Amino acid sequence: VDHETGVRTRPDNLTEPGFIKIFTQKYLGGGVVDSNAIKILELPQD
Amino acid sequence: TVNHGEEGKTREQTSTPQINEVSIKLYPVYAYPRTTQEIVDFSDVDIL
Numbered sequence A: 001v002d003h004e005t006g007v008r009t010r011p012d013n014l015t016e017p018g019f020i021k022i023f024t025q026k027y028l029g030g031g032v033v034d035s036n037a038i039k040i041l042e043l044p045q046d
Numbered sequence B: 001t002v003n004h005g006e007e008g009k010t011r012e013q014t015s016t017p018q019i020n021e022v023s024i025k026l027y028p029v030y031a032y033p034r035t036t037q038e039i040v041d042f043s044d045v046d047i048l
Helices: B037-042
Strands: A008-012 A021-025
16 A cells, blocks of 8 residues: 555755755555465475 | 914914824744644645
């Protein structure tokens, strides 16, 4: 799941002067919908 | 004051009109809501 805005990069160069804090943000989400569609296999690792 | 006084005499020095001053000082009315960016993005009513 993504947001309509997506990746947004705001280069805050004011709050801490002498610095650019490049605040890059992306709203990300993930969920297992219909778990019957996915299967897992843990190897014995010897 | 407008001194009528004596007509047949040297005319007296009337008092001048007074002036007052009103010191209207400006001051800031301010609002500082720390909204979270989450609500701005997630709301579909334009919460800002």
